[PDB]
Amino acid sequence: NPLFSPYKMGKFNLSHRVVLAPMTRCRALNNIPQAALGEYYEQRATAGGFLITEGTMISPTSAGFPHVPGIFTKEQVREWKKIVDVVHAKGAVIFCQLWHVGRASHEVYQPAGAAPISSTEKPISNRWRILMPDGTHGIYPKPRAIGTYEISQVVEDYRRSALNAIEAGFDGIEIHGAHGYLIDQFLKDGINDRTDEYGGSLANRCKFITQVVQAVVSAIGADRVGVRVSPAIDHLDAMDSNPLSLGLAVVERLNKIQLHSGSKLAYLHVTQPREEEEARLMRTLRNAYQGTFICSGGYTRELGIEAVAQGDADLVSYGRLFISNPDLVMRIKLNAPLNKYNRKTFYTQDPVVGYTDYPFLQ
Numbered sequence: 200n201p202l203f204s205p206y207k208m209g210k211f212n213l214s215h216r217v218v219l220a221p222m223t224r225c226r227a228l229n230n231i232p233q234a235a236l237g238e239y240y241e242q243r244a245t246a247g248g249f250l251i252t253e254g255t256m257i258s259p260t261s262a263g264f265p266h267v268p269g270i271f272t273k274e275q276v277r278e279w280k281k282i283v284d285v286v287h288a289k290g291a292v293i294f295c296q297l298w299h300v301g302r303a304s305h306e307v308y309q310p311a312g313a314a315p316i317s318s319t320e321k322p323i324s325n326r327w328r329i330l331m332p333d334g335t336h337g338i339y340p341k342p343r344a345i346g347t348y349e350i351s352q353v354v355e356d357y358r359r360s361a362l363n364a365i366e367a368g369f370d371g372i373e374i375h376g377a378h379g380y381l382i383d384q385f386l387k388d389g390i391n392d393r394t395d396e397y398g399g400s401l402a403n404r405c406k407f408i409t410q411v412v413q414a415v416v417s418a419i420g421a422d423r424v425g426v427r428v429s430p431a432i433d434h435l436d437a438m439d440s441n442p443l444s445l446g447l448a449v450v451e452r453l454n455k456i457q458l459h460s461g462s463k464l465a466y467l468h469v470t471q472p473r474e475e476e477e478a479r480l481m482r483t484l485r486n487a488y489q490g491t492f493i494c495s496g497g498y499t500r501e502l503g504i505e506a507v508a509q510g511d512a513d514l515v516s517y518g519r520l521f522i523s524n525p526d527l528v529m530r531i532k533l534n535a536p537l538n539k540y541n542r543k544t545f546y547t548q549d550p551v552v553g554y555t556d557y558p559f560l561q
């Protein structure tokens with residue numbers, strides 16, 4: 200089984216290719232990492248296994264979901280440290296995903312109920328609705344288009360959070376540049392129609408993610424940095440007229456950064472829509488990238504094996520199946536039956552129900 204072939208992700212020696220995909224679970228009450236998260240990650244940690252955490256706030260204005268962890272305060276750093284130690288004790292490698300939602304927010308998630316920030320004043324349409332703290336759904340508001348000074352500030356937020364992540368003991372961080380969030384709002388031409396140096400051409404649309412990655416790279420080292428994008432996913436009205444070209448353009452930026460840094464990023468992480476055309480899009484991005492490639496989106500044991508075997512990806516990340524199967528790695532290795540997951544408890548707040556109460560093997 201290819202999934203259990205060792206792999207060197209930079210300085211990190213992984214014993215298998217099954218990765219825990221980053222997943223927002225909303226158990227981090229008041230944006231503070233709780234003990235429950237420790238139990239959760241520890242249940243899924245394996246020796247030499249790679250784990251990516253739920254999206255984590257880089258500032259007070261970066262959230263769009265309830266009770267998601269942050270890492271911009273020393274209090275959050277101290278709490279994260281406890282979780283990282285528990286995970287490291289099992290011999291797992293873990294990265295903290297830095298997440299800023301941009302316009303995918305609500306005044307209820309913003310300080311002083313201010314408006315969410317974005318690349319333009321374009322709001323997500325009524326085709327989508329945001330999950331509110333009380334479990335109902337609300338209207339995505341019109342965002343405030345930021346200037347270049349504020350853009351530099353946001354980049355600084357990523358840099359600080361990355362350092363905080365290292366201070367907490369994380370092996371690295373992953374820049375969440377996909378699924379229609381802040382970075383994707385600058386990338387996609389369906390959204391970004393700015394007239395300044397951050398808009399217009401594809402080159403300009405890629406400026407933000409380039410500066411964000413360079414900033415974190417300069418702060419903690421390329422090998423401790425992973426980057427996630429989803430050029431072919433139009434979630435939250437974030438579509439581009441030429442996904443493959445957008446993807447290849449981001450890839451060129453990453454290769455350029457590595458060469459200029461004289462080091463390689465931990466990896467490029469790409470989420471695909473879920474068929475032959477999509478699979479060709481993925482492989483094309485991978486072939487263009489000088490480094491480790493992590494594929495995600497609707498993968499199964501069989502599809503994961505096929506991916507590594509056909510050389511389509513070095514590592515495979517699982518989300519939903521990892522929610523209901525804490526020992527997903529072991530089950531995949533023994534090819535044991537998987538348990539079903541309950542979507543109703545994907546984003547609830549209980550520290551146990553639908554979070555750490557999914558059973559281990561029979």
Ligand SMILES: Cc1cc2nc3c(=O)[nH]c(=O)nc-3n(C[C@H](O)[C@H](O)[C@H](O)COP(=O)(O)O)c2cc1C
Binds near residue numbers: 224254516519
């Ligand atoms: C409940 C839930 C929360 C998620 N949270 C995040 C997140 O915070 N950041 C991110 O980049 N992807 C997130 N994802 C997407 C996953 O990382 C992953 O790409 C997706 O689950 C892959 O498909 P799979 O569930 O079929 O394995 C989430 C998915 C689910 C189901």
